[PDB]
Amino acid sequence: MISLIAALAVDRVIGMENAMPWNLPADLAWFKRNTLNKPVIMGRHTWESIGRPLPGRKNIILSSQPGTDDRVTWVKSVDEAIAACGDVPEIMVIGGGRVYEQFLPKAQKLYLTHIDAEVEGDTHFPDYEPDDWESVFSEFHDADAQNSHSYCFEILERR
Ligand SMILES: NC(=O)c1ccc[n+]([C@@H]2O[C@H](COP(=O)([O-])OP(=O)(O)OC[C@H]3O[C@@H](n4cnc5c(N)ncnc54)[C@H](OP(=O)(O)O)[C@@H]3O)[C@@H](O)[C@H]2O)c1
Ligand SMILES: Nc1nc(=O)c2nc(CNc3ccc(C(=O)N[C@@H](CCC(=O)O)C(=O)O)cc3)cnc2[nH]1
Ligand SMILES: [Mn+2]
Ligand SMILES: [Mn+2]
Ligand SMILES: [Mn+2]
């Protein structure tokens, strides 16, 4: 099973200048809980944005060029990325925009955080078709001293 996990600001913005400008510790904790002990697939730009391997997960990087760091696994196509995960129950695709576009048709589950923030961005989550997806979990949180925007954790499953 393939799943996508992402945090979306208003208008599906996910990034600006190879960064995420907001800071929501509660959402990063949600990301860690839902990805730990699973393989994570990411594109090269997202690898450079994170800047280090994510511990406790097999890190798989998509790039058309040879890898430059043997602490992670480098692959050259979507099919190779999937194969490199082996026989696991759930593969987590962690972006960015161009990777999400390619894996969306193959995904059965979306873990989406909706952040009530307006962000200028240059990268968006794919337009997906709402009729294809059933919301099976949603949990709303107001802003607090640690998290400066309200946010909604949602899990959707392909109907
Ligand atoms: N809010 C969130 O949830 C979230 C999550 C992840 C990322 N982001 C943000 O998203 C932005 C990065 O997204 P992005 O769309 O620019 O880039 P990306 O999807 O992270 O990376 C694209 C790169 O991945 C490689 N790639 C993708 N598909 C491939 C394929 N089929 N075969 C081979 N290589 C492939 C290519 O690398 P080469 O050029 O080396 O061939 C391509 O240039 C940043 O702003 C980041 O902060 C946000
Ligand atoms: N919901 C969601 N939020 C995100 O921030 C997110 N980020 C990415 C890609 N970028 C990043 C950037 C930093 C870390 C990171 O530092 N993660 C630590 C945080 C642990 C914690 O704060 O409790 C990790 O070990 O996962 C992960 C992904 C992909 N999907 C996402 N999905
Ligand atoms: Mn091929
Ligand atoms: Mn197999
Ligand atoms: Mn806000």
Side-chain angles (χ1 to χ4, degrees):
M1 177 173 65
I2 293 167
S3 297
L4 277 60
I5 182 158
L8 280 57
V10 164
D11 291 339
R12 313 196 320 277
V13 169
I14 62 169
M16 180 53 174
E17 292 169 329
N18 216 41
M20 300 184 307
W22 61 79
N23 174 31
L24 286 181
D27 176 58
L28 286 179
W30 160 267
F31 172 88
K32 185 177 180 176
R33 185 172 64 90
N34 286 298
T35 60
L36 201 61
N37 303 313
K38 304 179 189 172
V40 296
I41 297 170
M42 72 193 88
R44 181 185 51 89
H45 292 320
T46 295
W47 160 247
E48 293 179 8
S49 185
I50 298 172
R52 57 273 297 160
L54 292 168
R57 282 147 282 192
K58 188 174 184 172
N59 287 228
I60 296 163
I61 323 299
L62 276 156
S63 175
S64 67
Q65 301 198 3
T68 55
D69 191 326
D70 276 352
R71 298 177 297 166
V72 300
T73 297
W74 297 84
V75 298
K76 297 188 194 297
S77 67
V78 167
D79 288 330
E80 190 186 1
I82 294 167
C85 293
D87 185 8
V88 298
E90 189 175 21
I91 296 170
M92 301 300 294
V93 176
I94 73 167
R98 289 153 66 191
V99 169
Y100 288 136
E101 287 173 358
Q102 291 169 84
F103 279 90
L104 179 65
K106 301 178 158 291
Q108 277 276 294
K109 193 168 184 176
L110 307 177
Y111 299 77
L112 298 182
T113 303
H114 309 278
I115 304 171
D116 292 314
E118 181 141 25
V119 165
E120 285 258 36
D122 58 21
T123 311
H124 296 80
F125 194 78
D127 210 4
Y128 65 91
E129 169 52 59
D131 294 358
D132 287 352
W133 298 91
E134 178 180 0
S135 182
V136 299
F137 174 86
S138 63
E139 181 182 279
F140 176 72
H141 296 267
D142 278 307
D144 60 26
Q146 290 177 55
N147 298 276
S148 62
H149 303 280
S150 56
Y151 53 99
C152 187
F153 295 134
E154 186 177 26
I155 300 172
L156 300 102
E157 292 176 354
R158 188 184 286 277
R159 294 186 179 282

